[PDB]
């Protein structure tokens, strides 16, 4: 079973979602975000001293 | 034996090629014994005899 959700970009706040499938009992999930990191690509030109 | 008061509740249904329904019936019986079950419509078929 495939499920799709959207979560805001905030650290330290839990969120919940509901999964509903006919013929079965409902289920609840809880998610929390701990870290996000960005990393650029670099190239050297020259140095000084 | 005889049975005098009954009711019906249907918690699930899916019209697939397999046995996709379940039903619960309440009853009050005068004495212990066996009894037969049978459907009164043509579009619905029952497994138990």
Helix, strand, coil content of chain B in percent (nearest 5): 0, 30, 70
Nearest Cα of chain A lies from the Cα of B8 at a distance, in angstroms, of: 18
Compute the 3-state secondary structure of chain A and give helix, strand, coil in percent, each to the nearest 5.
0, 20, 80
- Which of A21, A23, A24, A25 to mutate to test binding with chain B, by most B CBs within 10 Å of its CB? A23
* Closest chain A CA to residue B11: A23
Nearest CA in chain A to B22: A23
How far apart are alpha carbons B46 and B38 in whole angstroms? 7
CA-to-CA distance for B45 and B38, rounded, in angstroms?
9
Tell me the HSE value of B27 on the side-chain side, using a 13 A CA sphere: 10
Burial annotation B2-34 (CB, 10 A radius, 16+ → b, else e): eeeeeeeeeeeeeeeeeeeeeeeeeeeeeeeee
Is the CB of residue B16 less than 8 Å away from at least one CB of chain A? no
Chain A residues whose beta carbon lies within 8 Å of the beta carbon of residue B12: 22-23
User: Which structure tokens are listed for A10?
Assistant: 């905030």
**Cα of A26 to nearest chain B Cα, Å:** 14
Method of elucidation: cryo-EM
Resolution (A): 3.3
């Amino acid at each position: 079973y495939e499920h799709v959700t959207v979560i805001p970009n905030t650290v330290g706040v839990p969120y919940k979602t509901l999964v509903n499938r006919p013929g079965y009992s409902p289920m609840v999930l809880e998610m929390e975000l701990q870290s996000v990191t960005l990393e650029p690509t670099l190239s050297l030109d020259y140095i000084t001293c | 034996p005889s049975v005098t008061d009954m009711s019906c509740e249907v918690p699930a249904c899916t019209h697939s090629s397999d046995f996709g329904g379940v039903a619960i019936i309440k009853y009050t019986a005068s004495k212990k014994g066996k009894c037969a079950v049978h459907s009164m419509t043509n579009a619905v078929t029952i497994r138990e005899a």
